[PDB]
Amino acid sequence: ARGTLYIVAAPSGAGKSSIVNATLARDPQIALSISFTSRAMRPGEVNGQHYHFVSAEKFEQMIAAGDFFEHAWVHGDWKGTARQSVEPQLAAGQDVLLEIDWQGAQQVRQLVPGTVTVFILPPSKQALQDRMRKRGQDSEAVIAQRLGAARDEMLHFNEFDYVIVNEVFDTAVDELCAIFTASRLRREAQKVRHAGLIQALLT
């Protein structure tokens, strides 16, 4: 039986990376996908861990070769999910979580129906920019650019099945765990999981 595809989206600084890492730590049957990008590395990022960093020319070569399940132009740079990160794992029964923008999520919904998509919101407009300040060493000029990019991302929240407002971190983790647990209890997933038991009960 094929694995389930999960998408968690949020503007940067809403805390999706930290919530997802705590959730997958608690729910290890979902594997995290490492995206490719052509944007430059930020301090604290490690190539091969947080992203597969490539040049813009290399990313575009990979586009032409069909290497990407989805890809999109995000904040002036390429971001993308390689086919090797999704299609083989889903066919092998591995659940996969993608952390992508709304453009990539729209492409994925067209390719894989049944994807479970979640959007994470900050608890206030001020809380968003406060979290950007605490995280990086970004100049106030960069922070202003990211906030404008954050509103652009949040304008597409309505495309997602679930919405989490990340006020209390531990609560947001519980709530994402609840969504992942609930998705395994959906009728069609349980029919596969318990085909023999159900066959026995109804005969």
Ligand X SMILES: Nc1nc2c(ncn2[C@@H]2O[C@H](COP(=O)(O)OP(=O)(O)O)[C@@H](O)[C@H]2O)c(=O)[nH]1
Ligand Y SMILES: Nc1nc2c(ncn2[C@@H]2O[C@H](COP(=O)(O)O)[C@@H](O)[C@H]2O)c(=O)[nH]1
Task: Return the number of the residue (63 or 127) whose C-beta is nearest its own copies.
Answer: 127
Q: Does 80 bind ligand X (CB under 6 A)?
A: yes
Give the C-alpha distances (Å, rounded to integers) separating 46 from 31, 136, 141, 174.
Answer: 19, 15, 24, 28
Any known ligand binding at 134?
Answer: no
* Number of residues in contact with its own copies under rule CB under 8 A: 38
Cβ distance 117 to 4 under 8 Å? no
Q: Which two tokens mark 131?
A: 């979290």
Q: Does 155 bind its own copies (CB under 8 A)?
A: yes
Q: Contacts with ligand X in 92-151 (CB under 6 A)?
A: 99-101, 103-104
Q: Does 125 bind its own copies (CB under 8 A)?
A: yes
Q: Contacts with its own copies in 53-82 (CB under 8 A)?
A: none
Task: Return the number of the residue (39 or 109) whose C-beta is nearest ligand Y.
Answer: 39
Q: Does 96 bind ligand Y (CB under 6 A)?
A: no
Cβ distance 99 to 8 under 8 Å? yes
Task: Return the number of the residue (15 or 80) whose C-beta is nearest ligand ADP.
Answer: 15
Q: For the stretch 70-109, what's the b/e string if a residue is b when 16 or more beta carbons lie within 10 angstroms of its beta carbon?
A: bbbebeeebbbbbeebbeebbeeeebbbbbbbbbbbebbb
Which residue type occupies 100? I
Residue 135's binding partner out of ligand ADP, ligand X, its own copies, none, with CB under 5 to 8 Å set by partner kind: ligand ADP
Q: After which residues is the chain broken (C to N over 2.5 A)?
A: none
Question: Which residue ranges are tagged as binding site?
Answer: 10-18, 35, 39, 42, 51, 70, 79, 99, 101, 131, 135, 153, 166-167
